[PDB]
Structures are given as structure tokens and as C-alpha cells.
Design a protein around this ligand. Structure first.
Ligand SMILES: [Zn+2]
Length: 416
């Protein structure tokens, strides 16, 4: 959210909000320099070669998709200057998001969404799940475990393949059982995508449609929304999809988009979501919250240090907006639940963020006219927290001229 201290990649480590860390993942990975920009939120300016064991090298593989779809460059984000620029770019986007009432709400929900402590094998004991923490190096070289909710990290091999991912559990489906897990968003503020808009009467007699660029703040908010769903364990299995086209072809060759993506994008395409399906999940997760409240009630022991069982139950009381009677028992308030659930799944949408940002954005989830551009959001003359690319008091202020790749050409370098 609001990042109080200004960070420079070269700033000296302090073992608190600037330090070398190791991700639970696996392998004795060499620690990487990370920055805590806000409570429960860290930024790691490194290409993500840690989250998935089968995704460790950055070279384009044989058969890689071409330019518009994917983009490779094994050397991107390998120098201190790039990492510094990445850090400042990500920070500026957080401020732009936080500057809207919706973003402030989303960021708050994210900070409160602490991943549940359902690790221990003893149903009567609360224990933090290791993969919901990072290891922070101390002055003597030992490591201290720290819980976090969100990490913004550099992309893997495909530089423009942004996604919100997390570490799985052997048996628990953390993002779909109400528990939640620490989210790692592969993201880059140094590139953006194009789309074609019908800003000319919506009905154009076959003429060169304008070539616009997506505002990175919208792209990041999109992932933070998935992160929110995932932090509260209410994400929808990617296998659940809906058709958006019309008819389909052999081997399920029909235009289908996952439930998760349609609700996240919102707007027009949300109508393709079956209402019965929506209700089924709303109720399913209702019961998940209940089971959590029950586990909190039937809990006695807890593992850790600076955290007491009482202190934690209260932390989860706040996250899941639970009701606490005089006796101390927890229960799920159906009215509170419906409020929180709607917020996370209906209010937090890309469509709504586009309305608060007053920017131009593609109207439909699937983009059939893709383009990729190298950008630089750090210089104030290029992009600001309040106007994005459409700087007020410049010829870029009107008609989304700032996002127009031909009008504001100096800010968008076509990658092909
Ligand atoms: Zn998405």
C-alpha cells in the first residue's frame, strides 16, 4: 500500500525491512535481497527462478511462443540499476492503487488476510504453515522466520507471463479451503500490453483502430485481486470454466475462460458466469469459514513465540470477520460473510479499478489484438501516481493520448 520509506536497491541491509532472504520453496537457494514496503508485503527484485522447480532457467525454450504472446530475455532484471528501477516502478504502482478508495480497500483486505495456521497434524493445536513465511538473515548469519501475505517478484522465463502463485500443501488446498496462503505475484513494471479500442463511434468503417497500451497499475491491481481471493482461500479451481464465444469445435475447441478470470476481470464478461455456480461456491466457502471458526474454538495449544493462542484467534477473528460471544466462542455471521465475500469477488474487479483510474482498458477479457511494449514508469515526466500516462497539463491529458502508443510514442517501444 502506502510505502512510507523511499527505497533504493543499494540501500544497506538492516535485517528488518531491507535484507537478504530465502524462500521456503526448497533447495539451499542463495539468499536474495528483498524489501518490506508495507506490513506483510515484500518486494523481491529478482527474476522468479524459485517458486517452481521446473522453471529455473530464463532462456527461451525451443518452441517458445512468439513476441506478442510471450517475450524472453534471460538478462532482464540482472543488474543493480534494473532492480532499483523495478523496485521504484512497483512502489509507484502501489501508491497509484492506494490513491483510489477501491485500492486502499483492496490493500487493506490483503494486509488483513493472514494465511490460516492449519499446519499442525493435531487438530487441537494451531501451527503456522512453513510455506507462508520467508527466512530473513540475521547479523550472525542465522535465519529468522517471518510471516507474510504477499510478495511481488520478477517474472520467470516468459517476461510477460504475470500470475499470482503460491506454495501448495501435501494434502490441503490452501487457496480453496478458506485457509489462504502467501501469494507470490510474478510481475514487471517495465513492460505493458496493447489493445485496440473503438474510441471512434464504436462503429468504424474499416479504418486503422487506435493502438492503446494497458496501464500497468490496472495489470497489478488485477493480480492483487487474484491474490485477495487466494489469501482468503476462496479462489475458484482453474478447471471451472465458461464459454464466452458461441459454439464450440472438436476437442472442446470452444472459447472458454475460467470462472476465476471472468469474475476478476468483471464488467461485461461477468454475465457468462452461471448464477447457480456462483451461489454454489458462495455457500461452499461459507462452510469453510465455519470449519475455521470451529477449529479456533476446539483449539488449545499453539506453536511459536511472540504469538499467543488468544492473540492469533483474534487475528483470524478480524480476517474472517467472526463473531465472538461473551464465553469467547467464535461463529460465522452470515451477514458479515456476505459483505466480505461480495467485496472480494464482486467489488474488487479490474473493471471497477478502471473506473476509479479513469483510464482506457480493453472491454473483454480475451485480447485478439495483442502487442507488447517496453516502458519506463519511474521518471515523473512519463507517469505519475495520479494520472498514469495521461499527464494533466500536457497534450497527453485528453482522449487517453497518454496510452495512445502512436501519440505518446516516446513512452512505448514496440517489441514486435
Ligand atoms: Zn488473471
Amino acid at each position: 500500500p502506502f510505502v512510507n520509506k523511499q527505497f533504493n536497491y543499494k540501500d544497506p541491509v538492516n535485517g528488518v525491512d531491507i535484507a537478504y532472504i530465502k524462500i521456503p520453496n526448497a533447495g539451499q537457494m542463495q539468499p536474495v535481497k528483498a524489501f518490506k514496503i508495507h506490513n506483510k508485503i515484500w518486494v523481491i527484485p529478482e527474476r522468479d527462478t524459485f517458486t517452481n522447480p521446473e522453471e529455473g532457467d530464463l532462456n527461451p525454450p525451443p518452441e517458445a511462443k512468439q513476441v506478442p504472446v510471450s517475450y524472453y530475455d534471460s538478462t532482464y532484471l540482472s543488474t543493480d540499476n534494473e532492480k532499483d528501477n523495478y523496485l521504484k516502478g512497483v512502489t509507484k504502482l502501489f501508491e497509484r492503487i492506494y490513491s483510489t478508495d477501491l485500492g486502499r480497500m483492496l490493500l487493506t483486505s490483503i494486509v488483513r488476510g493472514i494465511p490460516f495456521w492449519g499446519g499442525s497434524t493435531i487438530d487441537t493445536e494451531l501451527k503456522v504453515i512453513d510455506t507462508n513465511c520467508i527466512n530473513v538473515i540475521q547479523p550472525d548469519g542465522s535465519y529468522r522466520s517471518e510471516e507474510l501475505n504477499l510478495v511481488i517478484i520478477g517474472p520467470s522465463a516468459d517476461i510477460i507471463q504475470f500470475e499470482c502463485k503460491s506454495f501448495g500443501h501435501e494434502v490441503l488446498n490452501l487457496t480453496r479451503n478458506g485457509y489462504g496462503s502467501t501469494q507470490y505475484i510474478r510481475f514487471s513494471p517495465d513492460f505493458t500490453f496493447g489493445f485496440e479500442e473503438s474510441l471512434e463511434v464504436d462503429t468504424n468503417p474499416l479504418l486503422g483502430a487506435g493502438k492503446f497500451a494497458t496501464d500497468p497499475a490496472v495489470t497489478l491491481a488485477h493480480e492483487l485481486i487474484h491474490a485477495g481471493h487466494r489469501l482468503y482461500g476462496i479462489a475458484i479451481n482453474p478447471n471451472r470454466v465458461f464459454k464466452v464465444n458461441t459454439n464450440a469445435y472438436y476437442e472442446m475447441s470452444g472459447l472458454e475462460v475460467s470462472f476465476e478470470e471472468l469474475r476478476t476481470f468483471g464488467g461485461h464478461d461477468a454475465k457468462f458466469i452461471d448464477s447457480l455456480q456462483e451461489n454454489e461456491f458462495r455457500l461452499y466457502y461459507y462452510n469453510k469459514f465455519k470449519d475455521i471458526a470451529s477449529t479456533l474454538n476446539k483449539a488449545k495449544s499453539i506453536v511459536g513465540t511472540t504469538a499467543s493462542l488468544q492473540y492469533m484467534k483474534n487475528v483470524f477473528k478480524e480476517k474472517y470477520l467472526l463473531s465472538e460471544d461473551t464465553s469467547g466462542k467464535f461463529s460465522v455471521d452470515k451477514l458479515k460473510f456476505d459483505k466480505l465475500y461480495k467485496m472480494l469477488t464482486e467489488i474488487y474487479t479490474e473493471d471497477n479499478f478502471v473506473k476509479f483510474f479513469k483510464v482506457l482498458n480493453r472491454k473483454t477479457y480475451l485480447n485478439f489484438d495483442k502487442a507488447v511494449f517496453k516502458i519506463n514508469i519511474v521518471p515523473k515526466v512519463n507517469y505519475t501516481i495520479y494520472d498514469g500516462f495521461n499527464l494533466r497539463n500536457t497534450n497527453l491529458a485528453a482522449n487517453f493520448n497518454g496510452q495512445n502508443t502512436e501519440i505518446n510514442n516516446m513512452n512505448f517501444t514496440k517489441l514486435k
